[PDB]
């Protein structure tokens, strides 16, 4: 049978889990709900019909007819073969396994079109925006670190701890008393305009909704077909058959009518119920997530809201604007970014000491001015909060490979079981 | 059966998704529409006939005949075998599965010829042009960066921020007060003549249209055959058979005529409809994209239109000129180029401040002349817009591997299901 | 059946597409036409007979005979078995599938002998000649670049742009006012004598024509056999059979003669036509390309015709001289050489300015003598045309691996489909 | 059947084509003729019998007997089974497929013994001798290059071109006026004694001839068996059978004698002819190459005959001396050595200028003494013939891997085709 072989052909497509050697390429390229819907909606029909093909062979088993005892073995076989072909439309039982394949094939194209067209475009855009996110994070603390030697009040910490300027940090260059201050006028980063660039020119969102709506209508078309077939299969499966057509029209030995019955509709009726109940439960899941302002209402960029110099999240939520789609992909792809975890702890220092009036930008100089005028001892405070927030993401920014979609193995289903007797 | 094994043999050819380790080798080598047309036009006939071969075995099932009860089991079997061979031309039903294979094989050669001949040639040409695209981008800003130390009006920014000249950028060499200006007379780049080089000598475009037109005519040849077969199968499938030829010509026990019927035309008739409706819908898609001035009317090189020094897009659109073909391949292969994303944000600064009169070439010196005469503070403005547009593409320009066309795995279809009873 | 398993065994041999990690190892080792001829001439017979073996089982299906009704089931089976063995020569129908295998096996040896013997020899020769081609290209411009500091007339460009001599190019050594001139007497390169070395000693060309002519004669031998078989199968397929030999010679119950018929010649006759029409169309393709002075009349080395110092293409075209064969391999293997693309643009500057009198050897000094006597500004013109033609091929000249002929995968055909009933 | 599964088991052994990552490991380890003989002599019997096993099943098909009509279905089946076992020796037809397997297995051991024992020993010996071949080549020119600064007559070329001594060659050390001359007394290289070391102690040649002669005698043993079987199968295949042995000896209902016939000898007779004609054609090929002084009479070391200082090929050709065997392996393994191609052009300069009196050792000083006394200009002649013959083989002399014998893939034959009906 052909039923359970596209099963493994699809099992190697939604199980990517790419072993991303580079710094960050764990790009899902589709939402989690999309994978769950596609696998269930397509795979489940293949599993059910695979059971059916295990017994719907030996066409003489599909239909049987009653014949007079005077007939021979071959004459009785002719009647069964004749009525199977020379057949309320009862031919729907004949093509029932064929139809369920057509639904599965038509339910697999919309995922394929997205993979061929909209997948490479969304891969580079997310990679570029997350590439430059850590650059802003690194420069912000480095500018604060470069401003360290300007606000010394404790001891003689203008310049000290000098066997090497950055002996734990870096073995190059040396430092001395500061004479420069950071005055910046270019406050807007690259990401600020990139958000506005994607705020118009709706060309990738249309490829998303169009693929989704094509899948939705196919589900309804399959749902009504199962209901129509279920009603038809619940009426009867027996009919009278006459083979007196041709030279046998004037035969006085062949009986006028024969009794025949299809004995495969019992299994088919059960299969239609399972598909029907699953589809009517899958439809609300698809419908509930059609709306753009669905779950994940909370903002994702609020971590960098006040970090370098500027403000973030000055925009609302809307519909057809090519936005709120990259935000969805960012949430499922923010798992591997070292800036996010580092910023995930700053907001939690809002307890006593850094409470109702937090700034969290130059907090290093907050507790180096009220101490003793005599005695520097700066080596502990001046580094324990400097390389603990920069060295983590300063490793491996050059690797770029492993973009193939799940080469994997043939470990999935293969060829059914029974081959004997 | 042989039906559903070229299915996996072709499934490993249009699913490349090469894991390109090098800087940029994600070369599709064919358009997205070509892959969709080839897979549907070739794969779908194989899927349909694979269902058919699951039951068209045991030749006694293919045809049946009515015989007198006085015949034995072997004598009745002789009649069925005789009329199956000794057969309106009714032999078209016998060779119907054979013909559909011939269409699939003939529909696979034009893709194969393009792969063997025109694939390696188009691989190097696109790689070379995109290799030199980033070189022009890097030198343009570097020349602007090298011209930084000439237009200082703020403070004493002629030379400053000197623990190291390019401590974030590069640890080599040092800088001082500028005395050289960039005077260029060789304005034409290499890409300018390469476009004109491909503007004539039409030798790769002919290999594209010739392969496409061969596929188109085969589709029409298959379309008319299905219509002719559908009309024939709708007339009748029964005939009279006589075996009295030879020593049996003067036999007084064998009846003169027998009634026979082919019982496989019912399934075959349904299969012809599915192929017919799909092909008549696939034909407009192929025809609509035959014209060279199809979709993607907008220019792709307009991003570099005024970037280094010159102007781009001084040419119109035409037909047989070996042009407008590399442009199509560039659009599907511009996904992985760091110059494109960097230039994709310059045009969006057209708001207030950089509006009706934009230049976007030396905008760094626009806002360093009206500030205070006293106080340099140049470290912020002089670097935050320099390594943010150059370091991105300065990583990994040496790797070159992974040009194999989808080694992949055997995860596709394999050997059907049923083997018992 | 054995028909459709050498199909995958050969599918892994002509689909190399080696993922050449090294600088250039994309060596085809055979012409494109050779692959197309071998795959079609060998594969197509296997595909056709694979259909035939799907039904030519159960030897009682191969032949059938008419027996008296008084015979039992076993007695009737004896007659069919007897006449199948105890058989115009009608045994050609028995061995028809066997013969077509013999043609396929004999049509596969000539490719195998070339692979074992002439493949490694041609691999190193093409690799060596293309290795030294870029060396001549690099030294030519470098000599021109080394001669830059001798012909200065503009400004004071004798020596300038000196924070580092080759800061974009190379971080080593320094330059000053030139005092040496390039006087060369050894004008002949290594490639000049290598062409003459291969101009005699015809030992690899004989291994090419001998393999080709063996394939050609086998095609004609198969072509006549199909025509002879087609005529034989069009006469009759019925004969009389007598089993009265031995102790049954004096048996009064066994009828003297029986009527038998072979019912597999109908499918075999169709298969012979398909092979015949394909072979008579493949023969002109092979014949048309037998001549050495076939397509690719234009020279390939005309790009380097005047580049370093000398002239190229001082030779005509001839036959048995071991030449004009490496030229064919060079054309299909000139795809990956950085010297070719670089030289492909020089000839197109033949427009106004560099028209009827082009030299294109030291054109850098053409436009540095008529400018202003005061003001050097040499940094733009002296480098923008120097590293743009040398750095491209100065990367990765050490890698050498991936010479295996298509390890690939088992993604091709495997084991047919039907296994039940 | 077991016939066509050692076919793929052997297809992965003679198709090595190792992807040798190291500098040179493309070691064939066996001659080309040995691979062709082994594959044809062993593979071809497996292909032929694989056709035979597609129909020699259902033992009732192997033999058939005529029985009285009064017998039942089971009684008639007993007669066929009895005479098949209770059987001119006619049992040779029963064991014919078994025997052809025994020939194939016995024809595969001699290749296996050579692989296990004599393969690793011959791998290191050829690797070592070719490792030291390039060392002699490199030192010869380097000594000539080191002697360059001693024979200057043109200009003031005693020392010149000194921004760096070997700026294109190597960035280390510097050169000046020469004061040392190359006086050598140790003229014998390591390879000179290694040739004499292998000139005696015949221990690897015996493992070669012994394996070859075992294969030769097996071919003759198979050849006579086919001729004996062909004569036997051409006499008759029918015999009388009596089952009256035991309690049936005094049975008055069982007929005394039965007529039986083997119907598989027709296919077997054809198979014997194909094996016979192939073997009698393969025997002269093996015999013609038994002689040690066969083809490849010309010397291979004549390229280095006068290169460094000494003379080569002072020895004749003989038989059992453990020599003339490494020479055969050298010819098939001289494909990948950079010294060979470099020396392949020196002998072709024998035209005018370097004709009847060639030396080709210090030809660099031939054309630097008759030029002008004033003006050095040495930079062109002193390097263009120095790094063009040394840098080629100065890359990658450390890699050592990929010695496995064709890991490959399962792309070969697998499991036959037909599984239904």
Numbering used by the authors:
A (entry chain D), B (entry chain E), C (entry chain F), D (entry chain G): 2 to 88, 101 to 434
Paper's wording?
To further elucidate the function of PANX1, we propose the full-length human Pannexin1 (hPANX1) model through cryo-electron microscopy (cryo-EM) and molecular dynamics (MD) simulation studies, establishing hPANX1 as a homo-heptamer and revealing that both the N-termini and C-termini protrude deeply into the channel pore funnel. Instead, we conducted extensive experiments and ultimately identified that residue V172—present in the intracellular linker domain—was suitable for inclusion of a Strep-tag; this linker domain was shown outside of the pore in previous structural studies. Single-particle analysis produced a 3D reconstruction of hPANX1 resolved at 3.15 Å under the gold-standard Fourier shell correlation criteria (FSC = 0.143), which was of sufficient quality to build models for the majority of protein regions. However, despite the confirmed presence of the full-length hPANX1 protein in the cryo sample, the electron densities accounting for the intracellular link (160–194) between TM2 and TM3 and the C-termini were subjected to local density falloff without local scaling and sharpening. We tentatively proposed the final structure as the hPANX1-MD model, which was generated based on the LocScale map and cMDFF-RSR modeling. In the resultant full-length hPANX1-MD model, the permeation pathway of the hPANX1 channel consists of an intracellular channel entrance, a pore funnel, and an extracellular cavity. The heptameric C-termini protrude deeply into the pore funnel and occupy the innermost layer. In particular, E414(422) and S424(432) formed major constrictions in the channel at the intra-cellular and extra-cellular ends respectively; the intracellular constriction was abruptly enlarged at N412(420) through a turn at G413(421). Thus, our current hPANX1 model is in a closed state.
